[PDB]
């Protein structure tokens, strides 16, 4: 049932209005007016279909809520989007559509961008990166070269996973075992087998001990630390320190990827090219199954002329992972005029020191031993080279649970179980989509799409809009003399508890709390002030920004970009609890509330949580 008549509000019109206003007013531009910084990052998407499905926005909603909250708390916020556009995902969608990946990728990116704007994510579109732009992959190639010069890239004979169906080698991390114990590509489920071949490898095993140990520095889920620990698989066996991890098969026999900025002489000595080496435009881009890539047939390009000698260019390309290994840095390098600060410049390093590590990164568990391992590896090499200031790229990682289709499988184009976001956004609105996805369950749980809960979410938003109408359009329903201490208390507590839920990324519970508050407004003949509506709107804006802006405007208030997070007075909350003063050797370092009297020895590990560490809690040596 699509909302109409008395069961609808003007969601399409409101959402377009506010999207337009945010663009004109530059609402999401990354500011630099504070010493408080927050880098909230989504895993950027592949343009490997005609558009997003409703699964994609789930994690993007979660980081948007935090980003929006942080702006309201006065932080400068980096929250950017971009296109993971090289390598197999983009190429395979082009090939399977009978299109050339250059124009087709551009065309699909336009659609993705339109979809994202229609959802009201607070991206600064001036920070966009595209891993296929030559100004971007200039740096991908630079990084590879520095990896080489450090001794960490070489061509050697290894046992590769040959994939006849793709015409290429694949890395061990790109292979999975099926129900019958057979090895297939993680993407496409193409059969593979082992074969000795001379191929480019990156020496990830040389970083294995640090990749393992440095997990201790990270606020990452146990499940993810475990996957990486087991993949690295460090074991002493008969005195040899061994690893299940092998060096990273890095070259692909495909057209659509970064060229290796490399040429060879008659003895196969490797030489490096200093400048950007662009992928030549070719029409003959189908993979040959021979062990060489399609670039090998481009005779004129492969013949590298230097000092009257004819050398041979490398004819492989880099994998899709090369651009995603450093894109979190590219966003910091990206400039208003469309250029990138040089990665090794002083200005880059200072900007990195301001923004890194990413404070909150959300993306799927499927990247456990792919991007989330590989990116850590490149980052550490850059750290060793004094290019980046931190040991680790991403401090806090959350893996959003998969949204499943109605078949109960993970939602994906490949399984033909997708729901098109354009239809939900048309029929119900972006605000409903965002609220619904957070309400489906805990962010980290998997969950199944359910039409009737979508419809219930829309009815709820309609209910919010109608309660605002009641109290705003009739001035007699607001009277500062009205006596209802419990409500003034409920209001102050809402601010406190919603704040805590946002901080905890417990967005489903946050919505339940907003629903309870609305139930309470519907019982009130009068309320003391419009302030609780203003505060509700400001806070709801983090999840339902379009309708929240509309409600704020109808209150005669300023737009969200000029607002602050609501403050509460704890002396209006009708129930107080014990405050425990924590000390470091007789000297006060923190105080905090302990809710109830449940535990005592378990609750001394709650005093360790607070960033500055029943009555007193002294810590003597």
Ligand X SMILES: CC(C)C[C@H](N)C(=O)NS(=O)(=O)OC[C@H]1O[C@@H](n2cnc3c(N)ncnc32)[C@H](O)[C@@H]1O
Structure tokens given for 103: 């124009």
Q: Does 427 bind ligand X (CB under 6 A)?
A: no
Question: Which of residues 68, 334, 371, 491 is near ligand X by CB under 6 A?
Answer: 371
**Taking a C-beta distance cutoff of 8 angstroms, is the pair 128, 213 a contact?**
no
613: cis peptide before it, omega within 30°?
no
- Residue of 70, 367, 379, 434 interacting with ligand X (CB under 6 A): 367
Give yes or no for a contact between 613 and 591, defined as CB atoms under 8 angstroms apart.
no
> With binding defined as CB under 6 A, does residue 411 bind ligand X?
yes
Question: Is residue 490 at the binding interface for ligand X, with CB under 6 A as the rule?
Answer: no
Which segment (95-103, 397-405, 493-501, 514-522) binds ligand X by CB under 6 A? 397-405
Binding flags for ligand X, 157-196, as an x/- string (CB under 6 A): ----------------------------------------
Binding to ligand X by residue 105, rule CB under 6 A?
Answer: no
Are the beta carbons of 7 and 466 closer than 8 angstroms? Answer: no
9 binds ligand X (CB under 6 A): no
Q: Rule CB under 6 A: is residue 44 a binding residue for ligand X?
A: yes
Q: After which residues does the chain break, using C–N > 2.5 Å?
A: 613
54 or 527: CB nearest ligand X:
54
Residue 299, classed as helix, strand or coil, is helix
Among 391, 410, 465, 526, indicate the residue that binds ligand X (CB under 6 A). Answer: 410
C-beta of residue 411 within 8 angstroms of C-beta of residue 419: yes
Q: Which residues, listed in sequence order, are joined to residue 398 by a DSSP beta bridge?
A: 362
Residue 58 found at the interface with ligand X (CB under 6 A): yes
Nearer to ligand X, 45 or 429 (CB): 45
- Helix H or strand E encompassing 413: none
Angle CA 12–14–16, to nearest 5: 70
57 in Cβ contact with 106 (< 8 Å): no
Q: Is 56 in the site for ligand X (CB under 6 A)?
A: yes
Nearer to ligand X, 341 or 403 (CB): 403
45 binds ligand X (CB under 6 A): yes
Instruction: In whole angstroms, give the CA distance from residue 87 to residue 90.
Output: 6
What's the order of all strands across the beta sheet hosting 616-618? 588-594, 578-583, 616-618
- Euclidean distance between CA atoms 162 and 185, whole angstroms: 10
Closest to ligand X by CB, 55 vs 532, is 55
Q: How far is the CB of 89 from ligand X (least distance, A)?
A: 7
Judged by CB, which is closer to ligand X: 85, or 537? 85
In the shown chain, the binding pattern of residues 278 to 317 toward ligand X, with x for contact by CB under 6 A and - for none, equals: ----------------------------------------
The interface with ligand X within residues 79-98 (CB under 6 A) comprises 84
Structure tokens belonging to residue 320: 């899709």
Give the separation between CA 83 and CA 101, rounded to whole angstroms. 14
Examine residue 115 and tell whether it contacts ligand X (CB under 6 A). no
Q: How far is the CB of 372 from ligand X (least distance, A)?
A: 8
Q: Does 46 bind ligand X (CB under 6 A)?
A: yes
Nearer to ligand X, 46 or 304 (CB): 46
We find the least distance from the C-beta atom of residue 56 to ligand X, in angstroms, to be 4
Q: Which residue is nearest to ligand X (CB)?
A: 364
Q: Which of 247, 336, 260, 339 is nearest to 293 (CA)?
A: 260
Cis-peptide into 357, omega within 30 deg: yes
Q: Per rule CB under 6 A, is residue 376 in the interface with ligand X?
A: no
- Rounded least distance, CB 42 to ligand X, Å: 7
Query: In the chain, what is the straight-line distance between the N-terminal and C-terminal CA atoms, in Å?
Result: 66
Here the tokens at position 444 are 């980290």
Give me 115's structure tokens. 């979809």
Question: Where along the sequence are the contacts to ligand X (CB under 6 A)?
Answer: 43-46, 55-56, 58-59, 84, 324, 363-364, 367, 371, 400, 402-403, 410-411
């Amino acid at each position: 049932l699509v909302p109409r008549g008395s069961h609808m509000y003007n969601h399409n019109e409101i959402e377009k209005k506010w999207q337009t206003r945010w663009e004109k007013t530059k609402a999401f531009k990354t500011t630099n007016k504070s010493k408080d910084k927050f880098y909230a990052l989504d895993m950027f998407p592949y343009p490997s279909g005609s558009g997003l499905h409703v699964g994609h926005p789930e994690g993007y909603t979660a980081t948007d809520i935090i980003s929006r909250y942080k702006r309201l708390k006065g932080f400068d916020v980096l929250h950017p989007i971009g296109w993971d556009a090289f390598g197999l995902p983009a190429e395979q969608y082009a090939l399977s559509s009978g299109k050339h990946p250059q124009p087709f990728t551009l065309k699909n990116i336009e659609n993705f961008r339109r979809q994202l704007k229609s959802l009201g994510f607070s991206f600064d579109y001036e920070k966009e990166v595209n891993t296929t732009d030559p100004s971007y992959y200039r740096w991908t190639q630079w990084i590879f070269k520095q990896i080489y010069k450090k001794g960490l890239a070489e061509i050697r004979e290894v046992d590769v996973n040959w994939c006849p169906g793709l015409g290429t080698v694949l890395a061990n991390e790109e292979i999975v075992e099926n129900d019958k114990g057979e090895m297939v590509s993680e993407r496409g489920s193409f059969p593979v087998y082992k074969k000795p071949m001379k191929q480019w490898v990156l020496k990830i095993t040389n970083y294995a001990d640090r990749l393992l140990e440095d997990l201790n520095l990270l606020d990452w889920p146990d499940s993810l630390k475990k996957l990486q620990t087991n993949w690295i698989g460090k074991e002493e066996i008969d005195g040899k320190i061994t690893y299940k991890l092998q060096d990273w098969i890095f070259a692909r026999q495909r057209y659509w990827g970064e060229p290796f900025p490399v040429y060879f002489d008659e003895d196969n000595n490797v030489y490096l090219i200093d400048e950007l080496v662009e992928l030549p435009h070719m029409e003959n881009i189908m993979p040959s199954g021979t062990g060489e890539g399609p670039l090998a047939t481009n005779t004129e390009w492969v013949q590298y002329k230097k000092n009257n000698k004819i050398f041979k260019r490398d004819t492989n390309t880099m994998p899709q992972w090369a651009g995603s290994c450093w894109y979190y840095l590219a966003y910091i390098m990206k400039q208003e005029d469309g250029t990138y600060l040089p990665i090794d410049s002083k200005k880059a390093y200072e900007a990195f020191s301001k923004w890194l590590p990413v404070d909150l990164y959300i993306g799927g568990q499927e990247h456990a031993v792919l991007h989330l391992l590989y990116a850590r590896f490149w980052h550490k090499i850059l750290y060793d080279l004094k290019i980046v200031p931190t040991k680790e790229p991403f401090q806090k990682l959350i893996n959003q649970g998969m949204i499943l289709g109605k078949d109960g499988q993970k939602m994906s184009k490949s399984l033909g179980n997708v729901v098109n976001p354009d239809e939900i956004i048309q029929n119900f609105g972006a605000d409903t989509l965002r609220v619904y996805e957070m309400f489906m369950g805990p962010l980290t749980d998997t969950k199944k799409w359910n039409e009737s809960t979508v419809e219930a979410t829309y009815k709820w938003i309609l209910r919010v809009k109608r309660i605002f109408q009641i109290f705003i359009e009739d001035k007699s329903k607001i009277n500062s003399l009205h006596k209802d201490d419990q409500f003034i208390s409920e209001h102050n507590l809402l601010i406190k508890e919603i704040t805590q839920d946002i901080e905890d990324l417990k967005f489903n519970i946050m919505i339940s709390k907003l629903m309870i508050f609305v139930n309470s407004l519907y019982k009130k003949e009068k309320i003391y002030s419009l302030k609780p509506l203003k505060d509700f709107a400001i806070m709801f804006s983090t999840i339902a920004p379009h309708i929240s802006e509309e409600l704020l405007e109808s209150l005669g208030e300023k737009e969200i970009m000029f607002q602050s997070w609501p403050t509460y007075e704890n002396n209006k909350i009708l129930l107080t609890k014990d405050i425990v003063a924590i000390q470091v050797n007789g000297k006060l370092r923190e105080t905090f509330e302990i809710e109830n009297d449940w535990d005592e020895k378990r609750v001394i590990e709650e005093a360790k949580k607070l960033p500055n560490v029943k009555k007193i809690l002294n810590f003597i040596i």
